[PDB]
Amino acid sequence: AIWQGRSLRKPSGGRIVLARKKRKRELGREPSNTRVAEQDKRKIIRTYGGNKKVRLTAAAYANVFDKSGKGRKVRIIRVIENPANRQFARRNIITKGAIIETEIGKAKVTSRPGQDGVVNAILLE
Amino acid sequence: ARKGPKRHLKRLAAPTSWYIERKAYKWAVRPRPGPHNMRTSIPLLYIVRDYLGYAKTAREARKILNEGKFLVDGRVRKDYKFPVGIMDVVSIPETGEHYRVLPNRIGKLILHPISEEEANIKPLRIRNKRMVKGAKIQLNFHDGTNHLIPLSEKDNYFTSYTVLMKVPEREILEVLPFEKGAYVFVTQGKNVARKGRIVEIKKFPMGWPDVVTIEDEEGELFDTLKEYAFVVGRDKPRISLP
Amino acid sequence: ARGIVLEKIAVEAKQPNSGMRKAVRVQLIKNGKVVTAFCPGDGAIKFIDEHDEVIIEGIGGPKGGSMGDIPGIRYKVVKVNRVSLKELVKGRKEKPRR
Amino acid sequence: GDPKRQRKKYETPPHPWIKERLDRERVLMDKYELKNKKELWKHETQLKNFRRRARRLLAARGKQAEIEREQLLARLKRLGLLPEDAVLDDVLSLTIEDILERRLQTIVYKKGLARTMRQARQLIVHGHIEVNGQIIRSPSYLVLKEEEDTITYARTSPFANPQHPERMMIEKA
RNA sequence: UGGAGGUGAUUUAAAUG
RNA sequence: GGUCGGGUCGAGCCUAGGCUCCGUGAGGGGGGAGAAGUCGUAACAAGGUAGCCGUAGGGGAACCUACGGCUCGAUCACCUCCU
RNA sequence: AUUCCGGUUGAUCCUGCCGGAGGCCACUGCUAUGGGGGUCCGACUAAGCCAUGCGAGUCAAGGGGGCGUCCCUUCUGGGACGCCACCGGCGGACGGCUCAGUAACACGUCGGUAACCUACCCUCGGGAGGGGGAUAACCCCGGGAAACUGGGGCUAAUCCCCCAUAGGCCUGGGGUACUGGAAGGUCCCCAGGCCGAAAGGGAGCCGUAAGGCUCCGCCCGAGGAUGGGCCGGCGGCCGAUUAGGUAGUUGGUGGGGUAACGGCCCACCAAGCCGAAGAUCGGUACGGGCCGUGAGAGCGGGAGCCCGGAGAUGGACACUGAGACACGGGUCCAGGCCCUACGGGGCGCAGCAGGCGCGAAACCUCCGCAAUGCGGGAAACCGCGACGGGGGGACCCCCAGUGCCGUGCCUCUGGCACGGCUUUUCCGGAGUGUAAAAAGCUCCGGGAAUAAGGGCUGGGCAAGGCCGGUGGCAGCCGCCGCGGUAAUACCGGCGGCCCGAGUGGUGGCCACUAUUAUUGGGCCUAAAGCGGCCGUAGCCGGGCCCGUAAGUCCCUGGCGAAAUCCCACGGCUCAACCGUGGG
Ligand SMILES: [Mg+2]
Ligand SMILES: [Mg+2]
Ligand SMILES: [Mg+2]
Ligand SMILES: [Mg+2]
Ligand SMILES: [Mg+2]
Ligand SMILES: [Mg+2]
Ligand SMILES: [Mg+2]
Ligand SMILES: [Mg+2]
Ligand SMILES: [Mg+2]
Ligand SMILES: [Mg+2]
Ligand SMILES: [Mg+2]
Ligand SMILES: [Mg+2]
Ligand SMILES: [Mg+2]
Ligand SMILES: [Mg+2]
Ligand SMILES: [Mg+2]
Ligand SMILES: [Mg+2]
Ligand SMILES: [Mg+2]
Ligand SMILES: [Mg+2]
Ligand SMILES: [Mg+2]
Ligand SMILES: [Mg+2]
Ligand SMILES: [Mg+2]
Ligand SMILES: [Mg+2]
Ligand SMILES: [Mg+2]
Ligand SMILES: [Mg+2]
Ligand SMILES: [Mg+2]
Ligand SMILES: [Mg+2]
Ligand SMILES: [Mg+2]
Ligand SMILES: [Mg+2]
Ligand SMILES: [Mg+2]
Ligand SMILES: [Mg+2]
Ligand SMILES: [Mg+2]
Ligand SMILES: [Mg+2]
Ligand SMILES: [Mg+2]
Ligand SMILES: [Mg+2]
Ligand SMILES: [Mg+2]
Ligand SMILES: [Mg+2]
């Protein structure tokens, strides 16, 4: 379905004719559009070589860090902005680099919730 | 290999360091993963059947192995696929003989007879060295094995040094540094199986490997890769070599 | 190649020779094309009949083509109903099914 | 690519009908009682190969060339084609007649074990001749100098009896 | 001895194997 | 695992548009062999009007004529330039 | 052998092409006694279609049962013993087959991963505490034409699920213990989170018992090994009667996704990227080691063996698993086909044999796991159309036979007559050989007995100026040329020549050919100097002095698998073939 193998175009602009079928080790997966919700929800993915990934689909809390090294677990109000996609903020989609507002103020997300399963942010002064 | 690991090996594609008749049969033994690498070792079946001649067929070689008659580095080995490599000791106690595995002047593996006393020690070149949990040091040797030392000893071991180890107890008894005036034995390359003393060491930028100049007994100087030079003594050999 | 005989013909030799060279028109099995083939030997044309199958091969002239006083013919008959024509012309063997 | 194909050990003439070559080869065939042309051609090729190695070694220099140079001389004197003090230039004066004189057929006839070349061939093929204790049935086998004098009747042969009727007729010659 | 150029002229008809 | 909503990906299928290819094809056109049914004699000797190139017009057919060019043109007389 | 010979004229010298003479490959006419060795035999057309049998299993020392023979007692039983299936574990992703697609990071070669995954194996450091659960087998009842498949009862595990601990991953703040050329890596201390182990199981003895003493095992962490993924530089076809091409296209910023880097995919911002040193498009084709030929420079090919790639009727797409989008496993569409009680259900030999079709073009529906190896098992072992052994075949190469000797006669090469000899080969036996057979090899008895063809005969080109037929008819002819009633050339007889278990025909590549020319060709009259000139890129460029060290030369480290080639020595009787060393 989602193939991540190679481009069908040469850098000169010419076309490429595929010489083999798609291999299983080349496939992607659906993106996790991590939403703000009242409750948390995550799932576990079995991956190449029999490994695991923790995929967060709905987030209600965040771990917020200061410049002094102290962290606090607080709840997420909403997404103020997200430079990754022009309409993520309207839909409350959380990714790395998004600006979120919490009970203790705005913060910038430093984690990849689709890969790690948690939301970590640095508190903005 | 279209979809999975290879498990077979044709005779014509066997490693060049084995003493084997390459056209007599279709198949060769595919060695099992283990201590050494493919270029520096040989399966034990060829030692029992082809080299020593204690068995004529594979079936009776396996019966000899399963009864526990062959020791490698002081430990019983029953797997006929077990890889036996450079500097190992092969022991037969029911006959009272011992050998060290060493490369030829042409790069082929041979058995060198040794004394019963010298059979208790194996020299191990230090391939890598790292920190490990609890802040201890792990030493990774050329035959793939490992050892632990306390943090207070960290200045007595570095890569390319050789450690003489008592087997099978695995107890250290001597450390031989890599420096000028040390005695070395070449294990790979064009100058394989030549031995001598270290004269100079040279280094280069961007990860190209370092090279050593060595003086032999008759007074000739030759170069090789540093990682091909295996320390065996201070100014005289500490093991018996041809 | 193998083919089926459609008719017998005769080709005049080129100047300054004189004589009639006996040949056949053959339709090839593999693609249906029709070609002319020479019948070598004295009296050889008498061993051929319409609807018979023949095996033909090159006549052997320069540049892989025709030869001698018969340009336009590029092939010659070698077998007739799976029997060697050379034998039939000499003897030693008989043409089957009458 | 293509795997190995086993190739002929002899070379054929570049033109089948040249009068002078035909006459020369007919004389050789009659004299040594060879069975066919290819047999003769085989020996010719052997000679050519020897010369081709000498021509290449004269114009060579280095360390492997010397080893090859002495190996060629040693092999040639082991077969009995050169004396013990020959040099490389002497390789270029060898003739086809030198090689044919080393055939087991010829040597059996030269020693006086048969009366004719044809009889020597039949004695070899039927198994009446031993070479250094071994029975060999190939008349074209080239005899080494070290074993030339240990060539006799087989110890199980009818001819190994000085009273055999056919042996007495051979001895009368 | 032998050569290279220029300008003038050319008195009917006459096919074929 | 069934039923419904939404998103998204997708072989196949249908219609139309444009190119491309094979198969037959009334009729038209030169090319090559054959051997002579026919009309003439254009090219070779000054071939009976020297031959040939470019362009243009004309004629059953080879061909003819006009302007400019070449010698890969015979004969005699005179003149010029050389060895 | 670093080669020539015939053909344009009444006769001559040239240019130039055609033919002859050599090697190798595929089909094929006629004809054939023996052995040995080898990497030979449905590749060319149809990656067309396939009846039947076989090509992947194994573990009883993981677990409850069924049944049988026996021992102690037995109302009942406990034991031991031996088969059966089921649950459970590992393997089935290798090996085998073919060359359709592909002009591409597919392949060769040198490097990189500090940007990654890895069941089985090796070393070292640690761990195995507490709970629960169903279900096959088995018994009751069944459905369906079949393929298949339903309900109730009962049961175990090294089966499955929870709790704890160990452990793992992400982010923020400090410290500097390690490797390395260089730390987004390793190690230590605080802090917020999320994920989250295990079978002390099995077998045998010393055990009165208690408990040891071995063997095979279970889980986590660090490193290696093995098998792979990804990336870069460089190298190897034809076409201009294809000149402009590209618009996720090229780069940037912010994310997602992946085992992992990446326009791999998105959102936003720019106008980039390739091209006459040939882009793009079209044609043909799996790449290499190697193979054919030639004095060499070169030219041509790349089925068979080894290494890499791809595919399983065509086109799409998933489940399990360490590894697959899986040839003898699953789904949809398309196209054929088989069985139906008509409701339904199944199958694609480019595995080994075997059949049909296509064609000029290719074998037995055999025997064995004894050897070499692979999977499983603690082991003894078991399975394997891989592999090994034979059967068929003018596949390639090596070594032989179809008689020998003496004395006479002839036309004296050779044939015939006498006298004698031999047994490779042939016929019948014993031994050895073999998994069993067969071949082969050593011996014994019989006996010259059982064994020669194909092409050519005017010149090139070795070999008849003889005889009988035919009469520009029939026929021959690579080329030049013969045949028109007195043919050395057609048909036949007798002679002769070449090669010989082979010898001729047809098609292809190299040579011939200095008719593709770097070595090494031509252009006044023979094919060929643009009608003339100016100039862009490219190629080619005057003398001296100083510097550099890219080209270039010399020395030395790491590489370019094996097989294939050359040499000596050694093992099969020698050889072909095979081994050990040098190149
Ligand atoms: Mg490095
Ligand atoms: Mg190939
Ligand atoms: Mg005229
Ligand atoms: Mg006129
Ligand atoms: Mg005129
Ligand atoms: Mg006019
Ligand atoms: Mg002429
Ligand atoms: Mg030619
Ligand atoms: Mg086929
Ligand atoms: Mg399978
Ligand atoms: Mg496979
Ligand atoms: Mg293309
Ligand atoms: Mg590459
Ligand atoms: Mg390229
Ligand atoms: Mg847990
Ligand atoms: Mg990223
Ligand atoms: Mg193809
Ligand atoms: Mg190719
Ligand atoms: Mg094949
Ligand atoms: Mg098929
Ligand atoms: Mg064939
Ligand atoms: Mg078959
Ligand atoms: Mg095992
Ligand atoms: Mg002659
Ligand atoms: Mg002919
Ligand atoms: Mg006559
Ligand atoms: Mg005749
Ligand atoms: Mg020329
Ligand atoms: Mg000009
Ligand atoms: Mg100019
Ligand atoms: Mg200059
Ligand atoms: Mg340099
Ligand atoms: Mg090699
Ligand atoms: Mg021998
Ligand atoms: Mg030899
Ligand atoms: Mg060999």
| Cβ atoms of residues B71 and B91 within 8 Å | yes
Distances (CA, A) of B26 to B4, B13, B14, B81, C91: 22, 10, 11, 18, 55
Q: Report the run of H or E that residue B121 belongs to, with start and end.
A: strand B121-132
Burial annotation A12-22 (CB, 10 A radius, 16+ → b, else e): eeeeeeeeeee
Q: What domain range includes position B148?
A: 120-178
- Confirm if B148 and B70 have CB atoms less than 8 A apart: no
Nucleotides of F under 7 A from a protein CB: 9, 34-35
The reply to whether B15 and B25 lie within a common domain is: yes
Side-chain-side CA neighbours of A105 within 13 Å: the count stands at 6
**Number of domains present in the structure of chain B:** 3
Identify the H or E element spanning A90. helix A88-91
Alpha-carbon span C44 to C21, nearest angstrom: 11
Give me the resolution in angstroms, 1 decimal: 2.2
Q: How far apart are CA B165 and CA B124, in angstroms?
A: 7
**Tell me, what DSSP letter sits at residue A27?**
B
> Can you read off the two tokens belonging to residue B35?
């201590």
CB within 8 Å of A23: residues ≥ 6 apart: A5
Nearest ligand atom owner, CA of D3: 2
- CA B143 – CA B89 distance, rounded (Å): 13
Asked if B58 and B49 touch (Cβ cutoff 8 Å), the reply is: yes
Does the C-beta of C33 come within 7 A of strand F? no
CA distance D45 to D30: 19
**Strand G-contacting residues in D 64-93, CB cut-off 7 angstroms:** 64, 67-68, 71-72, 74-75, 78
Distance D150 CA to ligand 19 centre (A): 52
Instruction: Read off the tokens for C97.
Output: 């099914």
CA distance B167 to D72: 54
Residue B5: both structure tokens together: 């690991």
CB atoms within 10 A of CB D35: 11
Amino acid at position B178, single letter = F
Task: Give the whole-angstrom CA distance, residue D129 versus residue D135.
Answer: 6
d(C-alpha D165, C-alpha D138), whole Å: 25
The nucleotide lying nearest B45 (C-alpha to C1') is: G373
Contact B163, B123 (CB under 8 A): yes
Whether residues B68 and B81 share a domain: the answer is yes
Which of B164, B181, B17 shows the shortest CA–CA distance to B89? B164
φ and ψ at D139, to 5 degrees?
A: -65, -20
Identify the residue whose tokens are 């070589």: A49
Helix (H, G, I), strand (E, B) or coil at C14: coil
Nearest to C52 by CA among C87, C7, C90: C7
List the domain range (segments joined by +) for residue D87. Answer: 16-173
Q: Sheet of B221-225: strands edge to edge?
A: B221-225, B211-215, B195-202, B183-186, B229-233
d(CA D37, CA D20): 15
CA-based nearest residue to B41, from B73, B6, B5: B73
| Cα separation, B79 vs C86, whole angstroms | 72
Distance CA A24, CA A47 (A): 12
Q: How many domains does chain D have?
A: 1
Distance linking the first and last C-alpha atoms of chain D: 61
> CB of B86 within 8 A of CB of B40?
yes
Query: How far is the C-alpha of A25 from the C-alpha of A20, rounded, in Å?
Result: 14
**CA quadruple D114, D117, D118, D120: dihedral, nearest 10:** 40
| Ligand 34 center to D133 CA (angstroms) | 11
Q: CA at C14, C1' at G146: how many angstroms apart?
A: 79
Strand-pair category, B195-202 with B211-215: antiparallel
Domain check: are B33 and B75 in the same one? yes
The CA-atom distances, in angstroms, between B182 and each of B128, B231, B238 are 20, 7, 11
- In angstroms, what is the C-alpha Rg of chain D? 19
B71-72 and B75-76 as β-strands: parallel, antiparallel, unpaired? antiparallel
- Residue A112 CA, ligand 16 centroid: distance in Å: 10
| Residues 38-97/C with CB < 7 A to strand G | 40-45, 55, 57-64, 67-70, 78-79, 84, 86-87, 90, 92-93
Task: Return the C-alpha torsion angle B225, B231, B237, B238, nearest 10.
Answer: -160
Same domain, B106 and B130: no
Closest nt to residue A22, judged CA to C1': G325
Q: Which residues pair with D153 in a beta bridge?
A: D129
Which pairing describes strands C75-80 and C20-28: parallel, antiparallel, or unpaired? unpaired
Report the DSSP beta bridge partners of residue C20: C12
How many angstroms separate the CA of B6 from the C1' of G92? 14
Contact B44, B81 (CB under 8 A): yes
In terms of domains, do B87 and B34 share one?
A: yes
Bridge-based pairing state of the strands B195-202 and B146-149: unpaired
Dist CA B43 CA B47 (whole Å) = 7
Residues B155 and B225 grouped into a single domain: no
C47 contact partners, CB below 8 Å, separation of at least 6:
C80, C85, C88, C89, C95
Residues 1-40 of chain A sitting with CB below 7 angstroms of strand F: 1
Nucleotides of G under 7 A from a protein CB: 1, 3, 18-19, 21-25, 28-31, 37, 39-40, 92-95, 101-106, 112-113, 117-125, 169-173, 177-182, 185-188, 190-196, 221-229, 231, 245-251, 254-268, 272-274, 279-281, 288-292, 301-302, 304-312, 316-318, 320-327, 358-360, 370-375, 378-381, 386-388, 396-406, 420-424, 442-444, 461-463, 472-479, 481-484, 490-492, 497-501, 505-508, 556-559, 561-565, 567-569, 573-574, 576-583
Give SS3 for B170. Answer: coil
**3-class DSSP string for chain D:** CCCCCCCCCCCCCCCCCCHHHHHHHHHHHHHHCCCCHHHHHHHHHHHHHHHHHHHHHHCCCCHHHHHHHHHHHHHHHHCCCCCCCCCHHHHHHCCHHHHHCCEHHHHHHHHCCCCCHHHHHHHHHHCCEEECCEECCCCCCECCHHHCCCEEECCCCCCCCCCCHHHHHHHCC
Strands A71-81 and B83-85 come out as: unpaired
Residue D105 φ then ψ, to 5°: -60, -50
Contact call for residues C21 and C68 (beta carbons, < 8 A): no
Please indicate, yes or no, whether residues B155 and B207 belong to a single structural domain of this protein. Answer: no
What stretches of chain C adopt beta strand conformation (E)?
2-12, 20-28, 34-38, 53-58, 75-80, 83-84
What's the rounded Cα separation, in Å, for the pair D138 and D124?
7
Q: State how far the Cα of A108 lies from the Cα of B60, in Å rounded to an integer.
A: 71
Whether D1 maps to a domain, the answer reads no
* Statement to judge: residues B7 and B114 lie in one domain: yes
Domain ranges of chain C: 1-98
Q: What distance in Å separates the CA atoms of residue A57 and residue B237, rounded to the nearest whole number?
A: 66
> How many residues would you count in chain B?
242
Helices (H), chain B: 44-45, 58-66
Task: Evaluate if the CB of C18 falls below 7 Å from strand F.
Answer: no
Dist. CA A64–CA A76, nearest whole Å: 10
Torsion, Cα of D109, D112, D113, D115 (10° steps)? 70
The answer to whether residues B8 and B85 belong to one domain is: yes
In this structure, the strands spanning A120-123 and A105-109 are antiparallel
Question: Which residues lie below 8 Å from residue D67, measured CB to CB, with a gap of 6+?
Answer: none
Name the 3-class secondary structure at B84: strand
D41 falls within a domain? yes
Indicate whether B10 and B100 sit together in one domain.
yes
